[model samples]
Target: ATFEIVNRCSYTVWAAASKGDAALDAGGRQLNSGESWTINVEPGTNGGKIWARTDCYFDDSGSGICKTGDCGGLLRCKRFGRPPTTLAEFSLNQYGKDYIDISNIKGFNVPMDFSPTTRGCRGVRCAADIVGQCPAKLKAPGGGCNDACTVFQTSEYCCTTGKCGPTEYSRFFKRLCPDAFSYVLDKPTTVTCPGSSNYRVTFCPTA
Candidate 1:
Protein backbone atom coordinates (compact mmCIF):
# COMPACT_ATOMS: atom_id res chain seq x y z
CA ALA A 1 0.00 0.00 0.00
CA THR A 2 1.05 3.57 -0.64
CA PHE A 3 0.12 6.77 1.17
CA GLU A 4 0.27 10.11 -0.53
CA ILE A 5 0.52 12.81 2.11
CA VAL A 6 -0.29 16.33 1.06
CA ASN A 7 -0.08 19.61 2.89
CA ARG A 8 -2.83 21.98 1.96
CA CYS A 9 -2.53 24.15 5.02
CA SER A 10 -1.43 27.72 4.50
CA TYR A 11 1.48 27.30 6.86
CA THR A 12 4.26 24.76 6.90
CA VAL A 13 3.58 21.32 8.33
CA TRP A 14 5.90 18.53 9.33
CA ALA A 15 4.45 15.15 8.43
CA ALA A 16 5.16 12.07 10.49
CA ALA A 17 4.21 8.42 10.32
CA SER A 18 5.04 5.29 12.22
CA LYS A 19 4.35 1.59 11.95
CA GLY A 20 4.74 0.04 15.37
CA ASP A 21 8.07 1.40 16.67
CA ALA A 22 9.52 2.04 13.24
CA ALA A 23 9.31 5.47 11.68
CA LEU A 24 8.45 6.02 8.04
CA ASP A 25 9.59 8.72 5.62
CA ALA A 26 12.82 8.98 7.60
CA GLY A 27 10.81 9.90 10.63
CA GLY A 28 9.30 13.09 9.14
CA ARG A 29 9.61 15.81 6.58
CA GLN A 30 8.77 19.47 6.33
CA LEU A 31 6.10 20.29 3.78
CA ASN A 32 5.33 23.77 2.59
CA SER A 33 1.89 24.52 1.27
CA GLY A 34 1.02 22.30 -1.69
CA GLU A 35 4.02 20.04 -1.06
CA SER A 36 3.54 16.31 -0.68
CA TRP A 37 5.31 13.13 0.30
CA THR A 38 4.70 9.50 -0.54
CA ILE A 39 5.09 6.53 1.75
CA ASN A 40 5.24 2.94 0.61
CA VAL A 41 3.95 0.40 3.07
CA GLU A 42 4.90 -3.23 2.99
CA PRO A 43 2.05 -5.68 2.83
CA GLY A 44 0.75 -6.95 6.15
CA THR A 45 1.84 -3.82 7.94
CA ASN A 46 -0.49 -3.02 10.78
CA GLY A 47 -0.98 -0.39 13.44
CA GLY A 48 0.18 2.61 11.50
CA LYS A 49 -0.47 6.26 12.22
CA ILE A 50 0.08 9.38 10.15
CA TRP A 51 -0.08 12.92 11.52
CA ALA A 52 1.17 16.46 11.06
CA ARG A 53 3.21 18.69 13.33
CA THR A 54 2.96 22.46 13.13
CA ASP A 55 5.06 25.45 14.18
CA CYS A 56 8.29 23.48 14.21
CA TYR A 57 11.88 24.64 14.09
CA PHE A 58 14.32 21.82 13.38
CA ASP A 59 18.07 22.20 13.27
CA ASP A 60 20.37 20.55 10.80
CA SER A 61 20.81 17.71 13.25
CA GLY A 62 17.05 16.94 13.04
CA SER A 63 16.26 17.90 16.58
CA GLY A 64 13.59 20.46 17.40
CA ILE A 65 10.24 21.04 18.94
CA CYS A 66 6.90 21.54 17.35
CA LYS A 67 4.16 23.57 18.93
CA THR A 68 2.04 20.47 18.47
CA GLY A 69 2.74 16.79 17.82
CA ASP A 70 6.29 16.84 19.13
CA CYS A 71 7.74 13.33 19.40
CA GLY A 72 10.45 13.52 22.03
CA GLY A 73 11.78 16.56 20.15
CA LEU A 74 13.11 14.26 17.45
CA LEU A 75 12.60 14.90 13.78
CA ARG A 76 12.40 11.20 13.11
CA CYS A 77 9.90 9.85 15.58
CA LYS A 78 10.40 6.32 16.87
CA ARG A 79 7.09 6.44 18.69
CA PHE A 80 3.79 8.19 18.31
CA GLY A 81 3.79 11.97 18.55
CA ARG A 82 2.23 13.96 21.37
CA PRO A 83 -1.49 14.48 21.48
CA PRO A 84 -3.66 17.32 20.23
CA THR A 85 -2.91 15.69 16.91
CA THR A 86 -5.34 14.64 14.22
CA LEU A 87 -4.49 11.07 13.30
CA ALA A 88 -4.89 9.03 10.18
CA GLU A 89 -4.73 5.50 11.46
CA PHE A 90 -4.60 2.43 9.28
CA SER A 91 -3.99 -1.29 9.08
CA LEU A 92 -2.98 -2.37 5.60
CA ASN A 93 -3.66 -5.77 4.11
CA GLN A 94 -5.13 -7.13 7.29
CA TYR A 95 -6.96 -10.20 6.17
CA GLY A 96 -7.64 -8.66 2.78
CA LYS A 97 -9.05 -5.51 4.34
CA ASP A 98 -7.55 -2.08 4.91
CA TYR A 99 -8.97 -0.47 7.99
CA ILE A 100 -8.71 3.31 8.14
CA ASP A 101 -10.01 6.21 10.19
CA ILE A 102 -9.49 9.84 11.03
CA SER A 103 -9.04 9.66 14.76
CA ASN A 104 -9.49 12.57 17.16
CA ILE A 105 -9.11 10.31 20.16
CA LYS A 106 -5.85 12.13 20.81
CA GLY A 107 -7.52 15.42 20.07
CA PHE A 108 -7.40 17.68 17.03
CA ASN A 109 -5.00 20.11 15.45
CA VAL A 110 -4.98 20.50 11.68
CA PRO A 111 -7.94 19.44 9.60
CA MET A 112 -7.51 16.20 7.67
CA ASP A 113 -8.93 13.87 5.09
CA PHE A 114 -7.96 10.23 4.83
CA SER A 115 -9.31 8.48 1.81
CA PRO A 116 -8.55 5.77 -0.66
CA THR A 117 -7.50 6.79 -4.15
CA THR A 118 -8.67 3.50 -5.61
CA ARG A 119 -11.26 0.74 -5.12
CA GLY A 120 -14.09 3.27 -4.94
CA CYS A 121 -13.89 3.27 -1.16
CA ARG A 122 -15.31 6.22 0.69
CA GLY A 123 -13.11 8.75 2.45
CA VAL A 124 -13.18 10.10 5.98
CA ARG A 125 -12.37 13.62 7.11
CA CYS A 126 -12.25 15.92 10.12
CA ALA A 127 -11.99 19.40 8.69
CA ALA A 128 -13.96 21.22 11.32
CA ASP A 129 -12.61 24.39 12.91
CA ILE A 130 -11.85 22.50 16.06
CA VAL A 131 -8.97 24.62 17.24
CA GLY A 132 -10.98 27.78 17.06
CA GLN A 133 -14.11 26.23 18.49
CA CYS A 134 -12.52 24.13 21.22
CA PRO A 135 -13.95 24.51 24.66
CA ALA A 136 -11.68 26.37 27.04
CA LYS A 137 -11.07 23.44 29.35
CA LEU A 138 -10.00 21.17 26.51
CA LYS A 139 -7.95 23.71 24.64
CA ALA A 140 -4.24 23.10 24.25
CA PRO A 141 -1.80 25.92 24.89
CA GLY A 142 -0.56 27.61 21.70
CA GLY A 143 -2.97 25.66 19.44
CA GLY A 144 -5.12 22.59 18.91
CA CYS A 145 -7.81 20.97 21.00
CA ASN A 146 -7.13 18.39 23.68
CA ASP A 147 -9.34 15.39 24.17
CA ALA A 148 -11.19 14.75 27.38
CA CYS A 149 -8.87 11.89 28.18
CA THR A 150 -5.83 14.09 27.78
CA VAL A 151 -7.31 16.93 29.76
CA PHE A 152 -9.06 15.05 32.55
CA GLN A 153 -7.32 11.66 32.62
CA THR A 154 -10.18 10.07 34.51
CA SER A 155 -11.73 6.68 34.00
CA GLU A 156 -14.79 8.34 32.53
CA TYR A 157 -12.76 10.08 29.90
CA CYS A 158 -9.98 7.56 29.37
CA CYS A 159 -12.25 4.51 29.42
CA THR A 160 -9.63 2.68 31.48
CA THR A 161 -12.19 0.19 32.66
CA GLY A 162 -13.50 -0.38 29.14
CA LYS A 163 -16.95 0.68 30.28
CA CYS A 164 -17.43 4.28 29.36
CA GLY A 165 -19.37 6.38 26.91
CA PRO A 166 -19.19 9.84 25.47
CA THR A 167 -18.86 12.74 27.85
CA GLU A 168 -19.58 16.42 27.31
CA TYR A 169 -16.09 16.95 25.94
CA SER A 170 -16.34 14.02 23.57
CA ARG A 171 -19.75 15.16 22.49
CA PHE A 172 -18.33 18.57 21.66
CA PHE A 173 -15.75 16.98 19.42
CA LYS A 174 -18.26 14.62 17.88
CA ARG A 175 -20.52 17.48 17.07
CA LEU A 176 -17.71 19.21 15.25
CA CYS A 177 -16.44 16.21 13.34
CA PRO A 178 -18.90 13.39 13.40
CA ASP A 179 -16.76 11.22 11.13
CA ALA A 180 -13.75 11.24 13.42
CA PHE A 181 -13.12 8.94 16.34
CA SER A 182 -13.96 11.53 18.97
CA TYR A 183 -13.41 9.09 21.76
CA VAL A 184 -11.93 5.72 22.35
CA LEU A 185 -14.12 2.74 21.38
CA ASP A 186 -15.82 4.84 18.75
CA LYS A 187 -16.25 1.88 16.46
CA PRO A 188 -18.55 3.58 14.00
CA THR A 189 -15.73 5.81 12.76
CA THR A 190 -13.67 3.00 11.34
CA VAL A 191 -13.84 2.40 7.62
CA THR A 192 -12.74 -0.72 5.76
CA CYS A 193 -11.66 -0.93 2.16
CA PRO A 194 -10.36 -3.64 -0.14
CA GLY A 195 -6.72 -4.57 0.15
CA SER A 196 -4.00 -2.87 -1.90
CA SER A 197 -5.84 0.39 -2.11
CA ASN A 198 -3.67 3.48 -2.22
CA TYR A 199 -4.64 6.28 0.15
CA ARG A 200 -4.22 10.01 0.29
CA VAL A 201 -3.94 11.89 3.55
CA THR A 202 -4.52 15.60 3.08
CA PHE A 203 -3.93 18.19 5.75
CA CYS A 204 -6.32 21.14 5.86
CA PRO A 205 -8.44 19.53 3.20
CA THR A 206 -10.89 21.88 1.56
CA ALA A 207 -13.51 19.19 0.85
Candidate 2:
Protein backbone atom coordinates (compact mmCIF):
# COMPACT_ATOMS: atom_id res chain seq x y z
CA ALA A 1 0.00 0.00 0.00
CA THR A 2 1.00 3.61 -0.40
CA PHE A 3 0.30 6.88 1.45
CA GLU A 4 0.02 9.94 -0.76
CA ILE A 5 0.29 13.10 1.31
CA VAL A 6 -0.98 16.24 -0.34
CA ASN A 7 -0.81 19.80 0.91
CA ARG A 8 -3.87 21.53 -0.45
CA CYS A 9 -3.57 24.65 1.69
CA SER A 10 -1.96 27.85 0.45
CA TYR A 11 1.12 27.58 2.66
CA THR A 12 3.87 25.00 2.94
CA VAL A 13 3.42 21.89 5.09
CA TRP A 14 5.70 19.35 6.66
CA ALA A 15 4.48 15.81 6.06
CA ALA A 16 5.41 12.89 8.27
CA ALA A 17 4.54 9.23 8.60
CA SER A 18 6.07 5.89 9.56
CA LYS A 19 6.91 2.51 8.05
CA GLY A 20 7.67 -0.20 10.59
CA ASP A 21 8.88 2.22 13.24
CA ALA A 22 11.07 3.93 10.67
CA ALA A 23 10.11 7.49 9.79
CA LEU A 24 9.00 8.10 6.24
CA ASP A 25 10.48 11.24 4.73
CA ALA A 26 12.96 11.07 7.59
CA GLY A 27 14.70 14.11 6.26
CA GLY A 28 11.60 16.19 6.99
CA ARG A 29 10.51 17.00 3.49
CA GLN A 30 8.78 20.28 2.72
CA LEU A 31 5.69 20.35 0.51
CA ASN A 32 4.56 23.57 -1.05
CA SER A 33 0.96 24.36 -1.75
CA GLY A 34 -0.62 21.63 -3.90
CA GLU A 35 2.51 19.48 -3.68
CA SER A 36 2.58 15.88 -2.52
CA TRP A 37 4.79 13.08 -1.23
CA THR A 38 4.10 9.41 -1.74
CA ILE A 39 5.42 6.84 0.73
CA ASN A 40 5.32 3.15 -0.13
CA VAL A 41 4.49 1.05 2.90
CA GLU A 42 6.43 -2.13 3.50
CA PRO A 43 4.65 -5.35 4.32
CA GLY A 44 3.76 -6.01 7.98
CA THR A 45 3.77 -2.36 8.89
CA ASN A 46 1.43 -1.66 11.79
CA GLY A 47 0.28 1.05 14.15
CA GLY A 48 1.25 3.79 11.78
CA LYS A 49 0.05 7.39 11.63
CA ILE A 50 0.31 10.46 9.38
CA TRP A 51 0.18 14.16 10.26
CA ALA A 52 1.27 17.57 9.05
CA ARG A 53 3.29 20.17 10.93
CA THR A 54 2.83 23.89 10.34
CA ASP A 55 4.66 27.09 11.22
CA CYS A 56 7.82 25.13 11.71
CA TYR A 57 11.33 26.50 12.12
CA PHE A 58 14.02 23.89 11.69
CA ASP A 59 17.78 24.40 11.79
CA ASP A 60 20.57 22.58 9.97
CA SER A 61 20.36 19.76 12.54
CA GLY A 62 16.70 19.12 11.67
CA SER A 63 15.87 20.33 15.15
CA GLY A 64 13.16 22.92 15.33
CA ILE A 65 9.65 23.62 16.48
CA CYS A 66 6.23 23.82 14.98
CA LYS A 67 3.58 26.20 16.15
CA THR A 68 1.05 23.43 15.74
CA GLY A 69 1.18 19.66 15.45
CA ASP A 70 4.82 19.41 16.40
CA CYS A 71 6.16 15.87 16.75
CA GLY A 72 8.56 15.99 19.67
CA GLY A 73 10.12 19.08 18.10
CA LEU A 74 11.49 17.12 15.17
CA LEU A 75 11.02 17.64 11.46
CA ARG A 76 10.40 13.90 11.07
CA CYS A 77 8.49 11.86 13.60
CA LYS A 78 8.94 8.22 14.48
CA ARG A 79 6.50 9.02 17.25
CA PHE A 80 2.98 10.36 17.03
CA GLY A 81 2.14 14.03 16.56
CA ARG A 82 1.28 16.20 19.55
CA PRO A 83 -2.34 16.62 20.50
CA PRO A 84 -4.53 19.34 19.01
CA THR A 85 -3.44 17.99 15.62
CA THR A 86 -5.39 15.90 13.16
CA LEU A 87 -4.27 12.31 12.74
CA ALA A 88 -4.77 9.50 10.25
CA GLU A 89 -4.34 5.98 11.57
CA PHE A 90 -3.77 2.91 9.40
CA SER A 91 -4.18 -0.76 10.20
CA LEU A 92 -3.38 -2.64 7.03
CA ASN A 93 -4.51 -6.22 6.37
CA GLN A 94 -6.17 -6.76 9.68
CA TYR A 95 -8.78 -9.49 9.49
CA GLY A 96 -8.64 -9.53 5.70
CA LYS A 97 -9.34 -5.85 5.32
CA ASP A 98 -7.57 -2.52 5.55
CA TYR A 99 -8.82 -0.26 8.33
CA ILE A 100 -8.36 3.47 8.55
CA ASP A 101 -9.75 6.64 10.08
CA ILE A 102 -9.28 10.37 10.52
CA SER A 103 -8.96 10.68 14.26
CA ASN A 104 -9.60 13.77 16.38
CA ILE A 105 -9.41 11.76 19.57
CA LYS A 106 -6.05 13.47 19.84
CA GLY A 107 -7.68 16.74 18.74
CA PHE A 108 -7.74 18.87 15.59
CA ASN A 109 -5.15 21.31 14.36
CA VAL A 110 -5.94 21.17 10.67
CA PRO A 111 -8.79 20.02 8.50
CA MET A 112 -8.11 16.69 6.81
CA ASP A 113 -9.55 13.95 4.64
CA PHE A 114 -8.42 10.36 4.20
CA SER A 115 -9.88 8.33 1.38
CA PRO A 116 -9.08 5.08 -0.30
CA THR A 117 -8.86 5.03 -4.05
CA THR A 118 -9.69 1.34 -4.08
CA ARG A 119 -12.85 -0.71 -4.23
CA GLY A 120 -15.43 -1.00 -1.45
CA CYS A 121 -13.88 1.63 0.74
CA ARG A 122 -15.45 4.85 1.95
CA GLY A 123 -13.58 8.00 2.97
CA VAL A 124 -13.44 9.18 6.59
CA ARG A 125 -12.94 12.85 7.27
CA CYS A 126 -12.78 15.64 9.86
CA ALA A 127 -12.57 18.69 7.67
CA ALA A 128 -14.10 21.31 9.92
CA ASP A 129 -13.16 24.65 11.49
CA ILE A 130 -12.37 23.07 14.81
CA VAL A 131 -9.94 25.74 15.92
CA GLY A 132 -12.33 28.62 15.60
CA GLN A 133 -15.10 26.60 17.20
CA CYS A 134 -13.07 24.84 19.83
CA PRO A 135 -14.52 24.99 23.31
CA ALA A 136 -12.84 27.37 25.74
CA LYS A 137 -11.76 24.72 28.24
CA LEU A 138 -10.66 22.37 25.51
CA LYS A 139 -8.51 24.93 23.76
CA ALA A 140 -4.72 24.63 23.51
CA PRO A 141 -1.91 27.13 23.90
CA GLY A 142 -0.18 27.04 20.51
CA GLY A 143 -3.42 26.49 18.58
CA GLY A 144 -6.30 24.08 17.80
CA CYS A 145 -8.74 22.22 20.03
CA ASN A 146 -7.46 19.94 22.75
CA ASP A 147 -8.60 16.36 23.18
CA ALA A 148 -10.65 15.48 26.22
CA CYS A 149 -7.95 13.14 27.43
CA THR A 150 -5.39 15.87 27.18
CA VAL A 151 -7.57 18.28 29.08
CA PHE A 152 -9.12 16.05 31.73
CA GLN A 153 -7.24 12.75 31.57
CA THR A 154 -9.85 10.96 33.55
CA SER A 155 -11.30 7.51 33.08
CA GLU A 156 -14.28 9.05 31.38
CA TYR A 157 -12.19 11.26 29.14
CA CYS A 158 -9.38 8.85 28.38
CA CYS A 159 -11.56 5.74 28.33
CA THR A 160 -8.80 3.82 30.04
CA THR A 161 -11.37 1.46 31.57
CA GLY A 162 -12.87 0.90 28.13
CA LYS A 163 -16.28 1.18 29.75
CA CYS A 164 -16.57 4.93 29.92
CA GLY A 165 -18.41 6.64 27.10
CA PRO A 166 -18.35 10.07 25.50
CA THR A 167 -18.65 13.28 27.43
CA GLU A 168 -20.04 16.62 26.26
CA TYR A 169 -16.55 17.48 25.07
CA SER A 170 -16.59 14.50 22.74
CA ARG A 171 -20.10 15.24 21.54
CA PHE A 172 -18.84 18.64 20.51
CA PHE A 173 -16.47 17.06 18.06
CA LYS A 174 -19.07 14.56 16.84
CA ARG A 175 -21.49 17.34 16.10
CA LEU A 176 -18.88 18.97 13.90
CA CYS A 177 -17.49 15.90 12.13
CA PRO A 178 -19.66 12.83 12.39
CA ASP A 179 -17.29 10.72 10.32
CA ALA A 180 -14.24 11.28 12.43
CA PHE A 181 -13.28 9.62 15.72
CA SER A 182 -14.28 12.07 18.42
CA TYR A 183 -13.37 9.93 21.39
CA VAL A 184 -11.37 6.79 21.95
CA LEU A 185 -14.43 5.07 23.32
CA ASP A 186 -16.75 6.16 20.55
CA LYS A 187 -17.90 3.57 18.04
CA PRO A 188 -15.26 2.45 15.59
CA THR A 189 -14.37 5.52 13.59
CA THR A 190 -12.68 3.28 11.06
CA VAL A 191 -13.72 2.29 7.55
CA THR A 192 -12.37 -0.78 5.84
CA CYS A 193 -11.33 -1.94 2.39
CA PRO A 194 -9.28 -4.66 0.79
CA GLY A 195 -5.59 -4.54 1.67
CA SER A 196 -2.77 -3.26 -0.53
CA SER A 197 -4.89 -0.46 -1.92
CA ASN A 198 -3.60 3.04 -2.48
CA TYR A 199 -4.99 5.91 -0.40
CA ARG A 200 -4.88 9.69 -0.42
CA VAL A 201 -4.60 12.06 2.55
CA THR A 202 -5.07 15.75 2.04
CA PHE A 203 -4.59 18.69 4.38
CA CYS A 204 -7.11 21.55 4.34
CA PRO A 205 -9.43 19.65 2.10
CA THR A 206 -12.42 21.79 1.06
CA ALA A 207 -13.41 23.18 4.47
Reference-based lDDT, each prediction = 0.89, 0.81
| TM-score per candidate | 0.97, 0.93
Taking all chains together, the TM-score of candidate 1 against the true structure is: 0.97
Q: Write the per-residue lDDT of candidate 2 for residues 1-207, one digit (tens) a residue.
A: 777889998889888786435675462467889998887766445777888777889898778888777777777676677777788888787767788888888888888999997778788888888888999999898878999899887998898888888889999999999988888878887887787777899999893
Per-residue alpha-carbon lDDT of candidate 1 for residues 1-207, written as tens digits (9 for 90 to 100): 789999999999999988758886576888999999998877777888999999999899999899889888888877788888999999988888989988898999999999999985899999999999999999999689999999888998999999988888989989999999888877578898998889999999983
Candidate 1 accuracy as lDDT: 0.89
- Lowest lDDT block of 10, candidate 2: 19-28
The residue pairs found clashing in candidate 1 are none
